[PDB]
Design an enzyme around this catalytic site. Structure first.
Site, PDB file in Angstrom:
ATOM      1  N   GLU A   1     -17.115 -30.350  58.301  1.00 56.12           N
ATOM      2  CA  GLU A   1     -17.605 -29.259  57.467  1.00 56.12           C
ATOM      3  C   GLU A   1     -17.291 -29.542  55.991  1.00 56.12           C
ATOM      4  OE1 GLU A   1     -16.975 -25.407  59.226  1.00 56.12           O
ATOM      5  OE2 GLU A   1     -17.906 -26.068  61.082  1.00 56.12           O
TER       6      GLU A   1
ATOM      7  N   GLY B   1     -12.783 -31.820  63.873  1.00 62.18           N
ATOM      8  CA  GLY B   1     -13.012 -31.195  62.583  1.00 62.18           C
ATOM      9  C   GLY B   1     -12.748 -29.699  62.519  1.00 62.18           C
TER      10      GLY B   1
ATOM     11  N   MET C   1     -24.898 -23.639  63.721  1.00 69.71           N
ATOM     12  CA  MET C   1     -23.929 -22.597  63.384  1.00 69.71           C
ATOM     13  C   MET C   1     -24.628 -21.438  62.668  1.00 69.71           C
ATOM     14  SD  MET C   1     -20.533 -24.814  62.530  1.00 69.71           S
ATOM     15  CE  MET C   1     -21.313 -25.849  61.426  1.00 69.71           C
ATOM     16  N   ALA C   2     -25.383 -20.674  63.451  1.00 70.35           N
ATOM     17  CA  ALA C   2     -26.221 -19.606  62.937  1.00 70.35           C
ATOM     18  C   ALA C   2     -25.413 -18.317  62.779  1.00 70.35           C
ATOM     19  CB  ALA C   2     -27.419 -19.404  63.839  1.00 70.35           C
TER      20      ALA C   2
ATOM     21  N   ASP D   1     -21.928 -16.777  59.844  1.00 69.30           N
ATOM     22  CA  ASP D   1     -21.338 -16.879  58.509  1.00 69.30           C
ATOM     23  C   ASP D   1     -22.405 -16.895  57.413  1.00 69.30           C
ATOM     24  OD1 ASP D   1     -18.819 -16.904  59.712  1.00 69.30           O
ATOM     25  OD2 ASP D   1     -18.812 -19.106  59.819  1.00 69.30           O
TER      26      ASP D   1
END
Ligand SMILES: CC(=O)N[C@@H]1[C@@H](O)[C@H](O[C@@H]2O[C@H](CO)[C@@H](O)[C@H](O)[C@H]2NC(C)=O)[C@@H](CO)O[C@H]1O
Length: 369
Positions: free
Chosen positions: A119, A76, A189-190, A192
């Site tokens: 995502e 992905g 995904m800590a 953005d």
């Protein structure tokens, strides 16, 4: 503790010192190395770059030097989008095609597991039905990996997933309590949290809220994201805290207002190596001449500005703070996006090779003994 590190198969195309080649891989830097990214063709796992098979041999070849190392292949990523996942999970037949293909592919190329990086289910074009279908996919994979281990007698393939930090995406796609049972670990995904898609400056990866924030904005920070995933049912031991070795950049409306929350007119100027407006590698900000580095006191992270350019990024100190945090919360370790955005060859920052990721390794007490 785990230290999970992503390799990217497009970093090989950067110019000069920024070019990331197999020689740059360190077999003992991380405990788990994840290869970004595989794709999908007719619902079956497939390569995305012309030389992936060559790189798979190198990548998994690291295990000869460090037999403790585990490798996973990620499918992905942001660019990959959602349609192929949606179409694959739409029916039991297509999921079975995918699952069986994944087992064969991982065994053929000597990977120890699969990392799911859709995502995201339920967002980015994916319909609401994909929330439960993602749960089913995770279960299908976990159960099929269990079965293959029993049948073959081989050590079971690992299953992880990279998951979003923001409540909008989490609630649209993720039955947290259910999927956490079936995942070996969860790569949060800590990062953005803020970026040039927003009309004011904000940090890529702040640890805590700023006093001025309210509403939804007050949850756009690492601590809130971690607590979100824990409270929704992820065992702390399975939650792996993602760490960015890049920053997010802005063009300021005025060089005279450089505050967090200052008006911005768009993305920062592209970096000389990364060439993507809105982001910069650590090696593109660590040695920024004639700039002013600042720290966001509430958020425990730095930013830096020069003229009308503003960048929120992570440094050695913020990585230390974040590891202290994850240890206090009893988390399973740290994850890092990405190897090739740290100063992997020590060419820029005067801090040696992999200064950020070596900080993670040290603070996690994972230094080869
Ligand atoms: C972090 C993770 O596990 N997955 C995502 C990544 O895809 C994403 O990185 C971005 O990947 C794109 C390819 O899908 C690249 O085109 C893009 O340059 C790259 N961006 C950066 C800053 O490296 C990361 C980071 O944004 O987060 C997830 O969204």
């Amino acid at each position: 503790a785990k230290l999970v590190c992503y390799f990217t198969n497009w970093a090989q195309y950067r110019q000069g010192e920024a070019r990331f080649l197999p020689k740059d891989l360190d077999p003992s830097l991380c405990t788990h190395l994840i290869y970004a990214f595989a794709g999908m063709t007719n619902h079956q796992l497939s390569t995305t770059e012309w030389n992936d098979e060559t790189l798979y041999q190198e990548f998994n070849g690291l295990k000869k030097m460090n037999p403790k190392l585990k490798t996973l292949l990620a499918i992905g990523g942001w660019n990959f989008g959602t349609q192929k996942f949606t179409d694959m999970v739409a029916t039991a037949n297509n999921r079975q095609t995918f699952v069986n293909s994944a087992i064969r592919f991982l065994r053929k190329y000597s990977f120890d597991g699969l990392d799911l990086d859709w995502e995201y289910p339920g967002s980015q074009g994916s319909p609401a039905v994909d929330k439960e279908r993602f749960t089913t996919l995770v279960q299908d994979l976990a159960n099929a990996f269990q079965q293959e281990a029993q049948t073959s007698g081989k050590e079971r393939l690992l299953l992880s997933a990279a998951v979003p930090a923001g409540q909008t995406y989490v609630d649209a796609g993720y039955e947290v309590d259910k999927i956490a049972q079936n995942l070996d670990f969860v790569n949060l995904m800590a990062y953005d949290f803020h970026g040039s898609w927003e009309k004011v400056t904000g940090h890529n990866s702040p640890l805590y809220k700023r006093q001025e924030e309210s509403g939804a904005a007050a949850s756009l920070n690492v601590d809130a994201a971690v607590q979100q995933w824990l409270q929704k049912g992820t065992p702390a031991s399975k939650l792996i805290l993602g760490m960015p070795t890049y920053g997010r950049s802005f063009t300021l409306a005025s060089s005279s207002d450089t505050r967090v929350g200052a008006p911005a007119t768009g993305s920062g100027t592209p970096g000389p190596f990364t060439k993507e407006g809105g982001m910069l590698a650590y090696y593109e900000v660590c040695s920024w001449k004639g700039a002013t580095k600042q720290r966001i006191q509430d958020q425990k992270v730095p930013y830096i500005f020069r003229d009308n350019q503003w960048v929120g990024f992570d440094d050695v100190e913020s990585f230390k703070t974040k590891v202290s945090y994850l240890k206090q919360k009893g988390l399973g370790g740290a994850m890092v996006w990405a190897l090739d955005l740290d100063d992997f060859a020590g060419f820029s920052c005067n801090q040696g090779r992999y200064p950020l990721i070596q900080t993670l390794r040290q603070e996690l007490s994972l230094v080869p003994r």
